[PDB]
Amino acid sequence: MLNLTKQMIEIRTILNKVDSSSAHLTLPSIVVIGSQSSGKSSVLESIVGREFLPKMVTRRPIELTLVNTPNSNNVTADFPSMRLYNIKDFKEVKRMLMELNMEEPIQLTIKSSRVPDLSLVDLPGYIQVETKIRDLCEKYLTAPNIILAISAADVDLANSSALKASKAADPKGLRTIGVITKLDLVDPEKARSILNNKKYPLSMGYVGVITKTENTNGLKQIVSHQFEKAYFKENKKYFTNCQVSTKKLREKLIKILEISMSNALEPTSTLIQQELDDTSYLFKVEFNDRHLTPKSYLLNNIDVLKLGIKEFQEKFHRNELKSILRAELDQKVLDVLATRYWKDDNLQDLSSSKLESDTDMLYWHKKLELASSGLTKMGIGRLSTMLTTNAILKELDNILESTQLKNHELIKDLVSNTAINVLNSKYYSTADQVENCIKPFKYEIDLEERDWSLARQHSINLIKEELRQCNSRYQAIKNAVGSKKLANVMGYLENESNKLLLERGSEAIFLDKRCKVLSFRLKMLKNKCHSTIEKDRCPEVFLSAVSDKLTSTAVLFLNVELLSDFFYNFPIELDRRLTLLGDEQVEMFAKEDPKISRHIELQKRKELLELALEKIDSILVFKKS
Amino acid sequence: MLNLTKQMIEIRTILNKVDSSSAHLTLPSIVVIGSQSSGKSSVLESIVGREFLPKGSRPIELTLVNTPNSNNVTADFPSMRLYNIKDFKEVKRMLMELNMEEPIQLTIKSSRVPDLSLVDLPGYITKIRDLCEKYLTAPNIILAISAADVDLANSSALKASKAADPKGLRTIGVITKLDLVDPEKARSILNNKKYPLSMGYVGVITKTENTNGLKQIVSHQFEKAYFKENKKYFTNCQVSTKKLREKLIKILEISMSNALEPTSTLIQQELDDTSYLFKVEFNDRHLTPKSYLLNNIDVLKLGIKEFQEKFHRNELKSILRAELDQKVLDVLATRYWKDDNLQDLSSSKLESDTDMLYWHKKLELASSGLTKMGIGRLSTMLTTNAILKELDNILESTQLKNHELIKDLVSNTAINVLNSKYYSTADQVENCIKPFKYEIDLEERDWSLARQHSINLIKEELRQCNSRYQAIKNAVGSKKLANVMGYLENESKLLLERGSEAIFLDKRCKVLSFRLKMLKNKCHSTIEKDRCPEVFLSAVSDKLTSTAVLFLNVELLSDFFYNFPIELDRRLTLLGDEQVEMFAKEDPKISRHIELQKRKELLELALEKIDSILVFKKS
Amino acid sequence: MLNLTKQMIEIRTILNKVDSSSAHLTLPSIVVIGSQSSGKSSVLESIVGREFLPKMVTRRPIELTLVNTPNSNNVTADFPSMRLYNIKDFKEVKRMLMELNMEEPIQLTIKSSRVPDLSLVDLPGYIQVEIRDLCEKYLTAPNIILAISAADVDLANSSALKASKAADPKGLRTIGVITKLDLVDPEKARSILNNKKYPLSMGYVGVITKTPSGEENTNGLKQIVSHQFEKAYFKENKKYFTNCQVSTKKLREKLIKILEISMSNALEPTSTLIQQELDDTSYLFKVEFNDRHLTPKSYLLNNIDVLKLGIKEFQEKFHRNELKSILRAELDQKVLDVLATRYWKDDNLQDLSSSKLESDTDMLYWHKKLELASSGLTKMGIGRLSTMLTTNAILKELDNILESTQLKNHELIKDLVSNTAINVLNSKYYSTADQVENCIKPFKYEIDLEERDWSLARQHSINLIKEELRQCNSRYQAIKNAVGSKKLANVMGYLENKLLLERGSEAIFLDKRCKVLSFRLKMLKNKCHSTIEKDRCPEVFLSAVSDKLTSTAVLFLNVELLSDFFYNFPIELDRRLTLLGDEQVEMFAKEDPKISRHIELQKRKELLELALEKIDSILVFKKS
Ligand SMILES: Nc1nc2c(ncn2[C@@H]2O[C@H](COP(=O)(O)OP(=O)(O)O)[C@@H](O)[C@H]2O)c(=O)[nH]1
Ligand SMILES: Nc1nc2c(ncn2[C@@H]2O[C@H](COP(=O)(O)OP(=O)(O)O)[C@@H](O)[C@H]2O)c(=O)[nH]1
Ligand SMILES: Nc1nc2c(ncn2[C@@H]2O[C@H](COP(=O)(O)OP(=O)(O)O)[C@@H](O)[C@H]2O)c(=O)[nH]1
């Protein structure tokens, strides 16, 4: 013979933590139901020995855990699902429960030397026949749970909603104890009649109580009992074969809960071992019994990414940076040529032999200057810098996608933001110094034959491709409209011959006109622009030559100020940013991937179920002795 | 040629301090009534020298005090303390925030200020009616304010003075806005044929921090020589704020000294009565609240010391065993009296195993049922209540029987002291109890002793049962309910319930009777006749108690009786001056005591003052 | 050559500080307009590179100044039109713009090494034209119009392009910008840009400022992301966008280029406007204030000195007996009223002409008649009278000195001075008041009066009647000015037993006093000559006795109140003036309208000179 309800309540509360399980339901609890004003709060406060229950309607279920604490002469409260502990003032507790109703069971624990080791549930706002109410009656009123029906006595037992719902939840009254309140408001003759009832008979009988009337609130319950005890000692003979007073209920609940919880110990062990055996298989199959620490997972996957960036570092600083850059400046040259040269009516004049010393010989010399300045004073500093920045940021996205981090968005953003944070710190340093080192190209260059030659081959290839893009777009209209139907629209808009159709036709004219321009220029580049300082009024070659000088000088200052510094500092910064993440964030970050969430959640269950079972089995082995 | 107004005002002030007296009302005060939005505020603010009325950003009991070397102008609110308001902006707020028959007692102190007492009744006059009688009818001087722009022949503020004083002495007239009206019509206003007053009439004008003291000097300079520039247009007249003030000063001097003779009379009349009441009801015995509280607490402290002696011993042992007696009965009902085989326990010799086993098992469950019941907790709480109960008895026997606030402080500090030791006592008791949780020992000395107890315990139980049983016979019928009893045995309102109770009481009395016979003759030998539950349970109850009562005195009692006086004393010192008066005034006779002696002291102070002034004023 | 937009926008901001000019008007700014939900706030935020516009109702326009601050990677915002500078948190910028909408333009400036040098005016949403009193004003003068139009909407139905023709027929100062190019076919997009209904010289720009998918706004990420997608679409659809201007990059490039051309061309006419505006303001300054500068603080102090001068010049002269006379005026009026309050209403006043009395009771009745009269003037309460008289004398005279100075138009200063003066005088109130009643102790009786004092006494008492009963009778002449019937001796009788019945009672009182003073006049002149022997004329015994107290009264008025005032008043004033803040002094000075004009005119000249030095210099360089 030994009382282990303290331990059994720990098991129930442990099992209450396993996500969606009928395991905790197998361990009974004393559920309290009673009409509003039937004295239900009064009988509860009597068990606790203090006031804390506020008396609006539908206060919402209160999962009350009474825990006996040695060396604690005072009464304390704890709302764990809010990390609130050792509340010595019960007025605060009373208003906390009021603040909460402004179905979710309030997790509140009471700890004191006076209090017995119990588990109770305060079911509030009743039903007098006339959905959410249906849910609580299934969740709390069923299972092995003991029902405490609070009857007021100054009410007929057929009229009480408490006993009516009790028979509905039962009947036969095997797991129902009926408490009869306001025993003082009825003659001891009828009081004994109500208790020894025969309409609503219960296995765990009836208890008759009187509960009316620390120092201000402790003495309150002492005064209340003095009166209750008085009435019962005086009317002793009137209450033959009767269970009466607060003391006898505390006594009853203690006896019944021990019987109830321990009888449910073998059923719960079977059910736990059952869920524990299913959950072990799932672990060994989906995740091959591998333990997963979230902060570890997080850090190890960052090491992989940090490795990926070292691999990118290896194959980038090179002519690859020249390529990304020159490709952008190639497009600027093409724009400089269209906005200046290509639209000019006398563009054919450059292909001619004769020249007029003053007016026309200087016209092209001036044109070539503001075309060159247009490109050199364009903004190479910001361009180069903001170009190579996107390049890194983009390759980072590729590295992130080629790793397990492809499933974690919150991590991916951390990496991306911290990457741009690193890059930004050197934006000005890079951009400004790049502009300063590209100034010698802003006003003519003393280029060698070698420089001029390389530029010429590139310019030919540039215009080759530019012309091939225009012809294809011209042929695109030629086929989509009709070879002949095209000439109809073109000649009409031109007015040399005769809505949606005219748009295609007008475009086709521009393209027809462009190709002619690019053709007489491409042909010239191949047949004429051979000399350096002499053939200088060959824009395509000169512009490409200055852009070659601009690119090779920019890529060197991009490395020194931006590239090198990023590769060193980014890992160091990334690590710093990770250590800033609290345990909470890290779990959420890792739980993004549903496979990893599934992983985290399954082991949390396994460990909790293992904890419950160990406690149960050690108790069972002892109980079998 | 002395102006003892400062003292006469002082006398009026302290006579207003007495709970219920018409002595202060005898002493005159310049009551002011004026036309609403005319300039009722402006006229008063001029007398003082600063702005304060909430009419610009209920009745104000204004008390002007002349103070030496106080070049600055300060304000007091004796009812709200503060006592020094330099900046008059917060005074303006104070009169507006307080305005959200009650007199606002405001005091103004400065060297510019003359010695005067005034009352500011708002605008024109169940509430309005009382203000008209309370301050105007009495021997208090009246002042009327209006506006020159509105009808001058029709003045409600002057009409109210005519209604309260038709063709009377104590009245002073005031006319404002003299800049808007010509000096001709204003000449007929002062020496009027319509409303003549023996005190006189005066004409003035009030238009347009010390920026507020400059504002009064601007408005005074505004029309200083205006009364000079047209001397004939105002000859045989009382003109300017300077002479108005001089008038209020000299009239009050006489008015207050006129009323000084009947007041000294009425004071003595109301003092001889109060000194008679003190002589008859209290016998001139003085009452200091703090002293009364401490002296009565000392009496209570002694009552606890006297009880400490008459407690513990067997007196504590008796209460504990009586509660254990009830548990033995409850254990016996739950494990014996509701069992058919109860006779088998005596009648014949038990079987070789099964029958001996069952009855030996039953006393083990019953013993554990008693020992593992929760004695520690039970014991502690029994004695805890015992102290609180006796504490109330000591309280009701004393002078504190009328003082609930104290009774609660006492009952609270006691439970706090007892609570301090609850765990240590209960736990200690549960330890000394454990060696009795599974032990079949003792001797015939305590067995024969517990046997005799078991007889008497079953006896009084049978008595109470028979009584209740035979009492239902009277309520229904000896042969009437007897037939109704048999009606429930074959089928196996009030009468069906009373019958079902009687069926139980019948067999129970027969159950206790056969058990009583057993205990008498059969139960005798110690450990041999062990299966005599009522005896074994009485033996264990006598041990449980004896051991418990020892640690109840060790842990709980000794510490209570030592520490409780110390903490009670500590808690009383934590009471404020306001608390002490409230705690003591709870008894109506004690409230009467203080109320009377407060009036007595104040009336003696007024008289000693008023008398000495009369000795001077006659010479 | 160089791009002096940064310097040109600095000039435009100065020209926005001159309270009455069309100077800033002649310098270009990019006025942005577009229908609600067309990407107007989205295009501005792409240039800025940070989210800053609130998304509340969009009330008053935003004067958006963009400063390219070197070494500042971090994008910071400042609200110059309030004391709020380098704001790092753009949430607070968003909510400040929102708070400022709870019709002047909102002065907001963005600083960064990323942000270009640009002037922009964010005009309210919808731009329907219908009301648009802001649009008419801002879309005119030399200003570039940026017409934000969404591609998903027909160009003919665009609110921005409509107003652009309504303000600029022929697109000579309008840049068309077509947003939402991602909600339109690239062939149709090229169609919108290569328009013919609304063709513009400045061009059309196709943009995509779509956010594709929380420190994302702290850095330039959200923005980088939005551009990366935009750059993708125009690289993929490069083939379709032939002879088109596409991307935010090209728009930012265009805005920078165009603004330079615009601002530099508009520079030359603006200098001509500033030069005239300065010449006009310099002229007024020469002709109104002979080109003399004004320092509000210096001005006030200098005028205070002139005021402090008057008090010193008033101190030396006004002491002697000039105050003693003002005290004699308000003390002889009490010798006048000692009789009226007592001695006058006596019927036995006549029998003293006979000079026959009884040694037992007749010689006792007239002795205590003068003991009550001698105490009715010595216990009168002159302390408060003399002190507050002199206090008010000093106070009135101070206002005179203030009108005598330029301080006549500044009331706040006039208050400050008078407040200080009364405070200084207050600190000596009781001290003086008590000293006037302390020195009057043996003078409360009559032993102090001699034969020599009686000389001026008998004569100044007949001279008392002289001036007073002539000026008081001059006002008795003021009644016969208005009118006439009267009748006229009969009114007095039927009263003795409407309007004129009131003067009948006035006349009956005057008749009594006119005879009562006269039989005294004919007697006291040739009756009482002796000092100790003759003691029955109160008029001669009190008119000089009050003035014998008056002589002893001005002495202690000087000792306590007067000496201290003249000493401590400049000291306390100088102290009280230091307390005044630079904001308070400007407000105190700006009380006079001529001074408030002076301050404004020289401030305008200063700003105008500042701006011109900058314009003229830029022009010299540009003309080379
Ligand atoms: N007379 C009497 N009143 C009681 C008793 N028990 C509870 N009450 C009163 O019943 C009233 C309302 O019930 P309450 O205690 O709030 O419990 P509820 O049923 O949760 O509302 C309170 O005012 C209690 O004092 C009792 O046993 N006797
Ligand atoms: N011109 C002039 N206005 C006065 C005079 N007396 C009072 N007032 C005006 O009366 C108005 C309101 O009266 P107030 O002084 O607030 O006293 P209230 O009657 O308590 O409201 C103010 O605007 C005053 O300026 C006066 O003698 N001359
Ligand atoms: N698809 C697409 N949406 C855009 C584009 N530009 C802006 N938006 C969206 O257009 C909506 C309203 O535009 P907003 O910038 O507020 O224009 P405003 O109302 O004229 O200031 C916003 O929800 C933007 O996300 C774009 O270029 N493409």
Side-chain angles (χ1 to χ4, degrees), chain C residues 313-337:
Chain C
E313 287 180 301
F314 175 63
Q315 171 191 23
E316 44 198 293
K317 58 180 181 175
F318 150 88
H319 175 226
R320 269 209 189 268
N321 306 118
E322 298 88 348
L323 175 79
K324 197 188 176 182
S325 305
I326 311 157
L327 191 70
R328 275 173 172 170
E330 298 282 274
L331 228 73
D332 274 290
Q333 258 198 281
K334 275 284 162 186
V335 165
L336 162 93
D337 278 288

Short mmCIF file of all heavy atoms in Angstrom, two decimals, chain C residues 313-337:
data_model
loop_
_atom_site.label_atom_id
_atom_site.label_comp_id
_atom_site.label_asym_id
_atom_site.label_seq_id
_atom_site.Cartn_x
_atom_site.Cartn_y
_atom_site.Cartn_z
N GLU C 313 18.75 110.37 -15.62
CA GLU C 313 18.42 111.78 -15.77
C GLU C 313 17.17 112.14 -14.95
O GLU C 313 17.06 113.27 -14.48
CB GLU C 313 18.27 112.17 -17.25
CG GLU C 313 19.60 112.22 -17.99
CD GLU C 313 19.54 112.61 -19.46
OE1 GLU C 313 18.86 111.89 -20.23
OE2 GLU C 313 20.18 113.61 -19.84
N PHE C 314 16.26 111.17 -14.74
CA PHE C 314 15.05 111.33 -13.94
C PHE C 314 15.36 111.25 -12.43
O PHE C 314 14.73 111.95 -11.65
CB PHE C 314 13.98 110.29 -14.36
CG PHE C 314 12.70 110.24 -13.55
CD1 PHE C 314 11.84 111.34 -13.50
CD2 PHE C 314 12.33 109.08 -12.87
CE1 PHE C 314 10.66 111.29 -12.75
CE2 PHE C 314 11.15 109.03 -12.14
CZ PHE C 314 10.32 110.13 -12.07
N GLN C 315 16.34 110.42 -12.04
CA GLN C 315 16.77 110.20 -10.65
C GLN C 315 17.24 111.48 -9.94
O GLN C 315 16.75 111.79 -8.85
CB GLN C 315 17.89 109.12 -10.62
CG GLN C 315 18.59 108.94 -9.27
CD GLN C 315 19.83 108.08 -9.33
OE1 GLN C 315 20.47 107.91 -10.37
NE2 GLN C 315 20.20 107.52 -8.19
N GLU C 316 18.20 112.19 -10.56
CA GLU C 316 18.83 113.41 -10.04
C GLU C 316 17.87 114.60 -9.86
O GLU C 316 17.91 115.24 -8.81
CB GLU C 316 20.05 113.82 -10.91
CG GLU C 316 19.84 113.73 -12.42
CD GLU C 316 21.12 113.71 -13.25
OE1 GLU C 316 21.83 114.74 -13.26
OE2 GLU C 316 21.40 112.67 -13.88
N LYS C 317 17.01 114.87 -10.86
CA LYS C 317 16.10 116.01 -10.82
C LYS C 317 14.85 115.80 -9.93
O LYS C 317 14.61 116.61 -9.04
CB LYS C 317 15.70 116.48 -12.25
CG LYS C 317 15.03 115.43 -13.15
CD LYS C 317 14.69 116.01 -14.52
CE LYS C 317 13.99 115.00 -15.41
NZ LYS C 317 13.56 115.61 -16.70
N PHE C 318 14.09 114.72 -10.17
CA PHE C 318 12.82 114.40 -9.52
C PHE C 318 12.89 114.20 -7.98
O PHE C 318 11.83 114.25 -7.34
CB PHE C 318 12.19 113.19 -10.23
CG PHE C 318 11.31 112.25 -9.44
CD1 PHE C 318 9.95 112.49 -9.29
CD2 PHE C 318 11.84 111.09 -8.88
CE1 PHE C 318 9.15 111.62 -8.57
CE2 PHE C 318 11.04 110.22 -8.15
CZ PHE C 318 9.69 110.48 -8.00
N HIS C 319 14.09 114.01 -7.39
CA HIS C 319 14.20 113.80 -5.94
C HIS C 319 13.69 114.99 -5.08
O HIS C 319 12.60 114.87 -4.51
CB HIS C 319 15.63 113.36 -5.52
CG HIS C 319 15.82 113.24 -4.03
ND1 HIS C 319 16.93 113.77 -3.40
CD2 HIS C 319 15.01 112.69 -3.09
CE1 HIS C 319 16.78 113.52 -2.11
NE2 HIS C 319 15.63 112.88 -1.87
N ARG C 320 14.48 116.10 -4.99
CA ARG C 320 14.26 117.32 -4.18
C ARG C 320 12.91 117.38 -3.42
O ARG C 320 12.80 116.82 -2.33
CB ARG C 320 14.49 118.60 -5.01
CG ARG C 320 15.92 119.11 -4.95
CD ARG C 320 15.98 120.61 -5.13
NE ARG C 320 17.36 121.09 -5.30
CZ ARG C 320 18.15 121.49 -4.31
NH1 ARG C 320 17.71 121.49 -3.06
NH2 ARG C 320 19.39 121.90 -4.56
N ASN C 321 11.89 118.07 -4.00
CA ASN C 321 10.56 118.23 -3.40
C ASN C 321 9.42 118.06 -4.43
O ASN C 321 8.26 118.32 -4.09
CB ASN C 321 10.46 119.59 -2.67
CG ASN C 321 11.54 119.87 -1.64
OD1 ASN C 321 12.31 120.82 -1.76
ND2 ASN C 321 11.61 119.05 -0.60
N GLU C 322 9.75 117.60 -5.66
CA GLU C 322 8.79 117.37 -6.76
C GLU C 322 7.83 116.22 -6.40
O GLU C 322 6.65 116.26 -6.76
CB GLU C 322 9.51 117.07 -8.08
CG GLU C 322 10.39 118.20 -8.60
CD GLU C 322 11.83 118.24 -8.11
OE1 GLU C 322 12.17 117.51 -7.15
OE2 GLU C 322 12.62 119.02 -8.68
N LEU C 323 8.35 115.21 -5.66
CA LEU C 323 7.60 114.06 -5.17
C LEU C 323 6.79 114.51 -3.94
O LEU C 323 5.61 114.17 -3.84
CB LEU C 323 8.57 112.92 -4.80
CG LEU C 323 7.98 111.66 -4.15
CD1 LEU C 323 7.34 110.76 -5.19
CD2 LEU C 323 9.03 110.91 -3.38
N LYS C 324 7.43 115.31 -3.04
CA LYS C 324 6.88 115.89 -1.81
C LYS C 324 5.56 116.63 -2.08
O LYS C 324 4.68 116.64 -1.22
CB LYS C 324 7.91 116.83 -1.16
CG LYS C 324 7.65 117.16 0.30
CD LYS C 324 8.59 118.24 0.82
CE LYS C 324 8.27 118.63 2.23
NZ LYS C 324 9.15 119.72 2.72
N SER C 325 5.43 117.23 -3.28
CA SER C 325 4.25 117.95 -3.74
C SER C 325 3.13 116.96 -4.10
O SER C 325 1.98 117.22 -3.75
CB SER C 325 4.60 118.81 -4.95
OG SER C 325 5.68 119.69 -4.66
N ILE C 326 3.48 115.82 -4.76
CA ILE C 326 2.52 114.76 -5.15
C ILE C 326 1.97 114.07 -3.89
O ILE C 326 0.82 113.64 -3.87
CB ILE C 326 3.10 113.77 -6.21
CG1 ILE C 326 3.75 114.53 -7.40
CG2 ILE C 326 2.02 112.80 -6.73
CD1 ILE C 326 4.79 113.74 -8.20
N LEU C 327 2.78 114.04 -2.82
CA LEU C 327 2.41 113.52 -1.51
C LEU C 327 1.49 114.54 -0.80
O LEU C 327 0.51 114.13 -0.18
CB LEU C 327 3.68 113.23 -0.68
CG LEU C 327 3.54 112.44 0.63
CD1 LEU C 327 3.18 110.98 0.38
CD2 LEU C 327 4.82 112.47 1.42
N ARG C 328 1.80 115.86 -0.93
CA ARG C 328 1.01 116.97 -0.37
C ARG C 328 -0.36 117.09 -1.03
O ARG C 328 -1.31 117.48 -0.36
CB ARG C 328 1.77 118.31 -0.50
CG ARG C 328 2.73 118.54 0.64
CD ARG C 328 3.61 119.77 0.43
NE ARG C 328 4.39 120.08 1.64
CZ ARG C 328 5.37 120.98 1.69
NH1 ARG C 328 5.72 121.67 0.61
NH2 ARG C 328 6.01 121.20 2.83
N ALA C 329 -0.46 116.75 -2.33
CA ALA C 329 -1.71 116.76 -3.08
C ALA C 329 -2.69 115.70 -2.54
O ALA C 329 -3.88 115.99 -2.35
CB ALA C 329 -1.43 116.51 -4.56
N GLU C 330 -2.16 114.49 -2.27
CA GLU C 330 -2.88 113.32 -1.76
C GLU C 330 -2.90 113.25 -0.21
O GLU C 330 -3.32 112.23 0.34
CB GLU C 330 -2.34 112.02 -2.39
CG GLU C 330 -2.49 111.92 -3.90
CD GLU C 330 -3.88 111.56 -4.39
OE1 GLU C 330 -4.18 110.35 -4.47
OE2 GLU C 330 -4.66 112.49 -4.71
N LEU C 331 -2.45 114.32 0.47
CA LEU C 331 -2.48 114.41 1.94
C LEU C 331 -3.30 115.60 2.43
O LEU C 331 -3.88 115.53 3.52
CB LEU C 331 -1.09 114.36 2.59
CG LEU C 331 -0.99 113.38 3.77
CD1 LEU C 331 -0.98 111.96 3.28
CD2 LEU C 331 0.25 113.63 4.59
N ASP C 332 -3.38 116.68 1.62
CA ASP C 332 -4.21 117.85 1.93
C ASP C 332 -5.68 117.47 1.67
O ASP C 332 -6.57 118.02 2.33
CB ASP C 332 -3.79 119.09 1.11
CG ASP C 332 -2.66 119.89 1.74
OD1 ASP C 332 -2.90 120.53 2.79
OD2 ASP C 332 -1.54 119.89 1.17
N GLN C 333 -5.91 116.49 0.77
CA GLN C 333 -7.22 115.92 0.45
C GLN C 333 -7.76 115.13 1.64
O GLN C 333 -8.96 114.87 1.70
CB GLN C 333 -7.13 115.01 -0.79
CG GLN C 333 -7.62 115.65 -2.07
CD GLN C 333 -7.92 114.61 -3.13
OE1 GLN C 333 -7.02 114.09 -3.80
NE2 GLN C 333 -9.19 114.29 -3.30
N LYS C 334 -6.86 114.76 2.59
CA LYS C 334 -7.18 114.04 3.84
C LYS C 334 -7.40 115.00 5.03
O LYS C 334 -8.05 114.62 6.00
CB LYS C 334 -6.17 112.93 4.16
CG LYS C 334 -6.48 111.60 3.46
CD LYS C 334 -7.65 110.83 4.12
CE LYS C 334 -8.23 109.77 3.21
NZ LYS C 334 -9.44 109.14 3.81
N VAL C 335 -6.88 116.24 4.94
CA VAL C 335 -7.08 117.34 5.91
C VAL C 335 -8.52 117.83 5.60
O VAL C 335 -9.30 118.11 6.51
CB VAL C 335 -6.02 118.45 5.69
CG1 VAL C 335 -6.38 119.76 6.40
CG2 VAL C 335 -4.63 117.98 6.12
N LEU C 336 -8.84 117.87 4.28
CA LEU C 336 -10.10 118.23 3.64
C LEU C 336 -11.22 117.29 4.08
O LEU C 336 -12.34 117.74 4.35
CB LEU C 336 -9.89 118.14 2.10
CG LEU C 336 -11.12 118.05 1.17
CD1 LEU C 336 -11.54 119.44 0.69
CD2 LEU C 336 -10.84 117.14 -0.02
N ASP C 337 -10.92 115.98 4.15
CA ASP C 337 -11.89 114.95 4.49
C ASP C 337 -11.86 114.52 5.97
O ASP C 337 -12.72 113.72 6.35
CB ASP C 337 -11.75 113.75 3.54
CG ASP C 337 -12.46 113.95 2.21
OD1 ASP C 337 -13.71 113.92 2.20
OD2 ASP C 337 -11.77 114.15 1.19
#
